């Protein structure tokens, strides 16, 4: 049931479009489009996701990559999601991310940034 | 180009990880990860994105990736993304930082995601 | 000023904690907390600082607390860290994200910390 | 001995200087000073520290808080570290950390740099 469940177009806080499709056992694919940044039009995204979840109430663990750069533009960096999908009525998908852009090494201390995004589905 | 040349390997990390990438198309990971620690045994799959564009400033090259730790023997009903950069020259890194998290019940949702940074080093 | 007064007082969060902070001596915070979950009975002391010059454009104003987990009657040996920020308005709120450390040994270092965030309102 | 291992100056990967005191029951005060960003001079910090570790080979957690606010300059923003202290003849405390610069709601999802820190004592 996760496979459906996950499966779809989900929105979050800041107005993003994530469109994705869940595989039998445990791939995601599909494409990310930013209300924020230095971004626009989409962004391939992969991930995984356990395609045999606990039965016992547990969520889906779950996570994804969008590397910044598409046909017009290129961000130089990439953020992670990691989260769990929750079922039901009011399905959700929880997140925290990291969000690393390429630096020099004495920059380093600052190419990171984290945050979380709450995505519920929208079709 | 040489982001893919630079990745594209068998990598290994303090903790005795075995992690096997390939980065080609455009920005696709792919490859297996074998965890030295926690609840995993054997290899599993990932995939994930990079820039495949990236400055040519002394900037890394920026890069994540996601594991969901269910193989066809095990299933610790958690994903790991890693975020970070490729930093090639003398001493080629993969610099990272990660998110692990577990699938749980809402009421133990604090306690669902750990926190931690990797350096990778090319074998 | 405004930022002394918005941070002062008592606040509680999603988990049902209880926040007592005051906020003076040019950047001081000072109080104590109190967990709805985890393995804490009764008052911890915190310590932060603030800024206690925010800018005026409409942005928040930055703070961060420690609590270490050991008061009178327990003892967790761990310590969490809010950073975070204080907005003010209709609907004030301290927006934060945490990293909670645990004691461990070096080998179980990678299980050390989790990470997530809170909100606060003020009761 | 955690009190006598914590307090003292201290330097990291960075190059920044860390002067702290261990009080008996969990106070940590002293001041910083950073080789990086918006920063000159010394800072105040303040945190807390467990006071009663275990004694099976664990660290002593511990974390503090830096407002980048001096009488010279205001960065408008705060870094807190959450780790714990290591002892022997390779002491050390290893860290992570947050810092949240006050943004506009807006802006919120750039607030927050993640990253870590290893410290090392020069006395
Ligand atoms: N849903 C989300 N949107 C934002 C966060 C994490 S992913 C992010 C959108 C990122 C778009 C691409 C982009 O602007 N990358 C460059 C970021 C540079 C940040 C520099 C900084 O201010 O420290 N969560
Ligand atoms: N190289 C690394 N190895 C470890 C860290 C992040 S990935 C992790 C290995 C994870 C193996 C799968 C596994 O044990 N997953 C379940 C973790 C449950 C942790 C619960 C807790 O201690 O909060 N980095
Ligand atoms: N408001 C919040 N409450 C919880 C989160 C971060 S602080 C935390 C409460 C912590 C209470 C003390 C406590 O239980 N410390 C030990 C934590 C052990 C977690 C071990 C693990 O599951 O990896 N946010
Ligand atoms: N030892 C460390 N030094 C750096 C990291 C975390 S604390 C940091 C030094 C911060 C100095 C004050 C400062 O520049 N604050 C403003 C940061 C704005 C970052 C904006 C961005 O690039 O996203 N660790």
Same mark, same amino acid.
């Given at each position: 049931?996760?496979?459906?469940?996950?499966?779809?177009?989900?929105?979050?806080?800041?107005?993003?479009?994530?469109?994705?499709?869940?595989?039998?056992?445990?791939?995601?694919?599909?494409?990310?489009?930013?209300?924020?940044?230095?971004?626009?039009?989409?962004?391939?995204?992969?991930?995984?996701?356990?395609?045999?979840? #606990? $039965?016992?109430? %547990? @969520?889906?663990?779950? =996570?994804?990559?969008? /590397?910044?750069? *598409?046909?017009?533009?290129?961000?130089? &960096? #990439? $953020?992670?999601? %990691? @989260?769990?999908?929750? =079922?039901?009525?009011? /399905?959700?998908? *929880?997140?925290?991310?990291?969000?690393? &852009?390429? $630096?020099?090494?004495?920059?380093?201390?600052?190419?990171?940034?984290?945050?979380?995004?709450?995505?519920?589905?929208?079709?």
């Amino acid at each position: 049931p996760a496979e459906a469940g996950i499966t779809g177009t989900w929105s979050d806080q800041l107005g993003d479009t994530f469109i994705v499709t869940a595989g039998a056992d445990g791939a995601l694919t599909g494409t990310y489009e930013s209300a924020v940044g230095n971004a626009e039009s989409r962004y391939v995204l992969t991930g995984r996701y356990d395609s045999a979840p #606990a $039965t016992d109430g %547990s @969520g889906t663990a779950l =996570g994804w990559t969008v /590397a910044w750069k *598409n046909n017009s533009k290129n961000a130089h &960096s #990439a $953020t992670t999601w %990691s @989260g769990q999908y929750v =079922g039901g009525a009011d /399905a959700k998908i *929880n997140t925290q991310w990291l969000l690393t &852009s390429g $630096t020099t090494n004495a920059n380093a201390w600052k190419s990171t940034l984290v945050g979380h995004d709450t995505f519920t589905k929208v079709k």
